[PDB]
């Protein structure tokens, strides 16, 4: 409690990591998303050589306490216009996408079964009935805005999570002109983007998230820094946990699924270290506020071998498949 | 509607007072347009009223008036001392008063 930077200690209400500071953008920067929401799949340690000038282990293999984060491709389903005002940054108008999933529409409804599930139903009506109104809203944003952010909802359905309400986060498109940001979001309306597009995995991502509730112990949003990604493995990729050295195919999901999360089916990001918040928690992977040029960021990741020993429970093998012939024929 | 208002606008500033003693029997009135004690000599003896409205429709009307007269100038800036038939309420500080042109000597 000595550091008053985190004192007083109070639990953060929103489970989703909130981007209190988005990265600065300029017209020279190409239009791109700055944040991508992920889920705490796991954080087993995997070996990787370190090619770093002056490293005591220069060109030497190192087991690293990395972290796999399930990242279902985010869907942009709306935009918000932010007008620069002498009293702060105000939301000019919000232009949603015409059609919304039940999951994101469920987010608004506390119960979702109540009577009619009317989320944006008339809004979907007036959207199609009067597209010109949306055109004027887009025109108003392009004419009277400086900060354009996009409404994005989580594809929890791909993830093995009971929660149905899609987490909605207001990711900010960065770079280019305001009209370019509106145009990108408009053409991307009701469309999903993988984190592999948002982050290149060589980029240093200051993932932020809410610390878990210890039982005011814990439950506080925190911003990790200096966390370069190591492998943005896609879900369709079954070679994601198989590097060049361990060429043998192995899914990122280890034996016995994941601890209190289940298997990974969608894209994931590999990153060394640990982050606040329990397993399968919505984690805000976001662009680094500072363009830090540390040699750790400069050096590339050349992952030696992905640990896939058993999740919840105990496993002494990388995958059962090799263990099948490794052990003698079972009684079965 | 600029064919009315035979009166002059005025404001009820305060009562006559020292630093710590107030005298509600005489009120200090700022007639607008009057900017010195020599111009305040024109409005001496003129009828001044406070016009307000109350909830009850007594007399079949919604408006009631407290009448008064201007006695003497106050200070150098053209404020005047007015004595009303009933002492003006302290809540009417900064309220508006009407200074007629009668009794006229012009």
């Amino acid at each position: 409690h000595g550091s008053l930077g985190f004192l007083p200690r109070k639990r953060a209400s929103r489970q989703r990591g909130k981007v209190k500071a988005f990265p600065k953008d300029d017209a020279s920067k190409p239009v791109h998303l700055t944040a991508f929401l992920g889920y705490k799949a796991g954080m087993t340690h995997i070996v990787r050589d370190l090619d770093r000038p002056g490293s005591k282990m220069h060109k030497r293999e190192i087991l690293e306490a990395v972290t796999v984060i399930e990242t279902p491709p985010m869907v942009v389903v709306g935009v918000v216009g932010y007008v620069e005002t002498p009293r702060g940054l105000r939301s000019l108008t919000t232009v949603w996408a015409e059609h919304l999933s039940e999951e994101v529409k469920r987010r608004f409804y506390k119960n979702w079964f109540k009577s009619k599930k009317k989320a944006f139903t008339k809004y979907a009506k007036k959207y199609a009935e009067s597209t010109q109104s949306i055109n004027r809203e887009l025109e108003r944003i392009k004419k009277y805005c400086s900060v354009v952010r996009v409404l994005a909802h989580t594809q929890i359905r791909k993830t093995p999570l009971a929660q149905k309400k899609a987490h909605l986060m207001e990711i900010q498109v960065n770079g280019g002109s305001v009209a370019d940001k509106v145009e990108w979001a408009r053409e991307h309306f009701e469309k999903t983007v993988d984190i592999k597009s948002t982050f290149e995995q060589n980029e240093m991502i200051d993932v932020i998230g809410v610390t878990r509730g210890k039982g005011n112990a814990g439950y506080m949003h925190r911003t990790q820094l200096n966390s370069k990604i190591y492998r943005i493995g896609a879900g369709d990729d079954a070679k994601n946990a198989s590097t060049d050295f361990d060429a043998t195919e192995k899914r990122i999901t280890p034996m016995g699924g994941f601890v209190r999360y289940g298997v990974v089916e969608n894209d994931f990001v590999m990153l060394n270290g640990a982050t606040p918040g329990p397993v399968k928690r919505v984690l805000t992977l976001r662009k680094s506020l500072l363009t830090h040029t540390s040699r750790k960021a400069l050096e590339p990741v050349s992952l030696k071998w992905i640990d896939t020993a058993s999740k919840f429970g105990h496993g002494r093998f990388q995958t059962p498949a090799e263990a099948k012939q490794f052990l003698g024929t079972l009684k079965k | 509607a600029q064919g009315h208002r035979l009166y002059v606008k005025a404001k009820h500033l305060s009562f006559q007072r020292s630093k710590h003693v107030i005298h509600p029997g005489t009120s200090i009135v700022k007639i607008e347009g009057c900017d010195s004690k020599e111009e305040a000599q024109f409005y001496l003896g003129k009828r001044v009223c406070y016009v307000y409205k109350s909830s009850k429709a007594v007399r079949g009307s919604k408006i009631r008036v407290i009448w008064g007269t201007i006695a003497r100038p106050h200070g150098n800036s053209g404020a005047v001392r007015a004595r009303f038939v009933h002492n003006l309420p302290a809540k009417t500080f900064g309220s508006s008063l009407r200074v007629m042109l009668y009794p006229s000597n012009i």
Binding site: E84, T85, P86, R87, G88 | K9, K11, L13, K30, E32, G33, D35, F93, G94, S95, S96
Partner: protein, 187 residues
């Protein structure tokens, strides 16, 4: 002299204390006062002088930095804020930075008893409230100093249109013979 229901004051070049005392007396007189361009107020004394005054104030309370909040504090100290009369008078004051849209299309007056050019001796150092606020915590200086040109450009265009429109009646004035036929009345 005469009062209006709402008086809009352009605080550019007005001394803080002189304007606040005039405004406070007008508020107690039963008038609604709006002060725009509160970031353009001037204070006698060099930059370091009121810097230490405000820095000492920071040492002391809810420290406000915005220029209007500085002016609002100055006016409040000149009011009987411990009584209902003082509180009611305070609520009739609306101090803002810049000129918001409801007020940029309304006439703005100035207080000669508070103007710097008529009260401060030439060659005396002065500290603008907006500049002084910018380094003590206020962070909206750049964006309001950028938007003013947009307001000025629009207002300048309006004045040119009004002046061009006025030229027609001005020419038509001397064109009509009755203007000079009965101009012996001084009109």
């Amino acid at each position: 002299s005469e009062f209006q229901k709402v008086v809009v004051i352009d605080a550019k070049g007005h001394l803080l204390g002189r304007l606040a005392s005039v405004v406070a007396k007008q508020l107690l007189g039963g008038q609604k006062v709006v002060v725009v361009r509160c970031e353009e107020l001037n204070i006698s004394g060099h930059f370091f002088r009121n810097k230490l005054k405000y820095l000492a104030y920071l040492r002391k309370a809810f420290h406000f930095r915005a220029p209007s909040r500085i002016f609002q504090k100055a006016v409040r100290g000149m009011l009987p804020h411990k009584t209902a009369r003082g509180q009611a008078a305070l609520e009739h004051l609306q101090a803002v930075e810049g000129i918001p849209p409801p007020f940029d299309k309304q006439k703005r007056v100035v207080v000669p008893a508070a103007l710097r050019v008529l009260r401060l001796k030439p060659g005396r150092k002065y500290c603008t409230v907006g500049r002084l606020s910018s380094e003590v915590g206020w962070k909206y200086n750049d964006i309001v100093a950028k938007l003013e040109e947009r307001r000025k450009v629009k207002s300048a265009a309006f004045y040119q249109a009004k002046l061009a429109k006025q030229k027609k009646i001005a020419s038509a004035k001397e064109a009509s013979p009755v203007n000079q036929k009965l101009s012996q009345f001084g009109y």
